[PDB]
Design a protein around this nucleic acid. Structure first.
Ligand SMILES: Nc1ccn([C@H]2C[C@H](O)[C@@H](COP(=O)(O)C(F)(F)P(=O)(O)OP(=O)(O)O)O2)c(=O)n1
Ligand SMILES: [Cl-]
Ligand SMILES: [Cl-]
Ligand SMILES: [Mg+2]
Ligand SMILES: [Mg+2]
Ligand code: NA
Ligand code: NA
Length: 326
DNA sequence: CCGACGTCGCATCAGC
DNA sequence: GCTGATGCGA
DNA sequence: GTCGG
């Protein structure tokens, strides 16, 4: 909140470049500049003071000067007026509707919530669910509710097979007082980088969760990644809890640390970390960290026995999950 | 300057 | 059917 | 949009 005004501006610009301009790299650029400024311990008084921080170039320095003086940004004042941008931005807020689909819908005349509801036939499964829970999905999840959700998921997974280990990651693992959704990392001794000794490992858990009516909808589902909707049960007369987004990722047990590092995030932290890895000559994914031999081809997975080992390989002092919120 | 920018799973599609 | 590329998402 | 070689 120290430099909230500036970070909010940069974020709005990031969203515009991603949704409207479909320029994913410009989006990352703003996201980064925004991230760095957010951690800066001082109240920025000029664009020059900001350009010092890495990720902030000249263009963003000027905008900051504009924002400090005027308290707003003309570039954004305009984007806000443009109907197509306003429309594309709104549509993208529906889960399942990205920049491409949004721009398309706008071409066909579909640019509002009402339009979406009277044209459900033009939406695929995912998009139809996003429309359905449009309201609920924008609501944050209190940590208290996250704890109830954790209890249900872990206790149900245990009932399916005691060898399953379920770990809630994401912002929750980073200590956040509220989350956008629930991200669950799952492991079972019967699924390793060596072999899949048992099929449907992910399926059965999803199955069980649907059985107790915790998971209510499915946006997508494969052998290792599930993306759906869930809801905490309510008591007598008690109003129902909002529907929430839940993601479950099945990861080879022996590659748990690379997995938990990946799933804990944040997204920007992971991107910055992976970038640093490359600068140091390593490549990291949710399964392992590997070296980059001259040519470029990734080498063999290095040994990993802790999240810390990963950090060491790239000469980065370890950072608690709570300090990985960039 | 200038081509890179983290990495990958699922859904959907085009070309065969 | 498959593979390879695009869209959307983690 | 930024930047390092
Ligand atoms: N582009 C991305 C997106 C995600 N992630 C990893 C790292 C993320 O921490 C993790 C979860 O994805 P999430 O989409 O639930 C998230 F990011 F929003 P979370 O941090 O959980 O915040 P919230 O509470 O709002 O959900 O996937 C990643 O590596 N790259
Ligand atoms: Cl771009
Ligand atoms: Cl790998
Ligand atoms: Mg999350
Ligand atoms: Mg998630
Ligand atoms: Na800079
Ligand atoms: Na969307």
């Amino acid at each position: 909140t120290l430099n909230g005004g500036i970070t909010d501006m940069l974020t709005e610009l990031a969203n515009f470049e991603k949704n409207v301009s479909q320029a994913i790299h410009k989006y990352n650029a703003y996201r980064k500049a925004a991230s760095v400024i957010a951690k800066y311990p001082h109240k920025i008084k000029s664009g020059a003071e900001a350009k010092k921080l890495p990720g902030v170039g000249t263009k963003i320095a000027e905008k900051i000067d504009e924002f400090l003086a005027t308290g707003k940004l003309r570039k954004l004042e305009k984007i806000r007026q443009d109907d197509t941008s306003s429309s594309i931005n709104f549509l993208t807020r529906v889960s399942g509707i990205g920049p491409s689909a949004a721009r398309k819908f706008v071409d066909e005349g579909i640019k509002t919530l009402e339009d979406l509801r009277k044209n459900e036939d033009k939406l695929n499964h995912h998009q139809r669910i996003g429309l359905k829970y449009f309201g609920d999905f924008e609501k944050r999840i209190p940590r208290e509710e996250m704890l109830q959700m954790q209890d249900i998921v872990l206790n149900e997974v245990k009932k399916v097979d005691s060898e399953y280990i379920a770990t809630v990651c994401g912002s929750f693992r980073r200590g956040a007082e509220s989350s956008g959704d629930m991200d669950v990392l799952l492991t079972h001794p019967s699924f390793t980088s060596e072999s899949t000794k048992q099929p449907k490992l992910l399926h059965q858990v999803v199955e069980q969760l649907q059985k107790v009516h915790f998971i209510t909808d499915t946006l997508s589902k494969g052998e290792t990644k599930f993306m759906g909707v869930c809801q905490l049960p309510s008591k007598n007369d008690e109003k129902e809890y909002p529907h929430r987004r839940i993601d479950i990722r099945l990861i080879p047990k022996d590659q748990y640390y690379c997995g938990v590092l990946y799933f804990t995030g944040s997204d920007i932290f992971n991107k910055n970390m992976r970038a640093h890895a490359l600068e140091k000559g390593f490549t990291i994914n949710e399964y392992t960290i590997r070296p980059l031999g001259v040519t470029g081809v990734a080498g063999e997975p290095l040994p990993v026995d802790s999240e810390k080992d990963i950090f060491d390989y790239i000469q980065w002092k370890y950072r608690e999950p709570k300090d990985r919120s960039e």
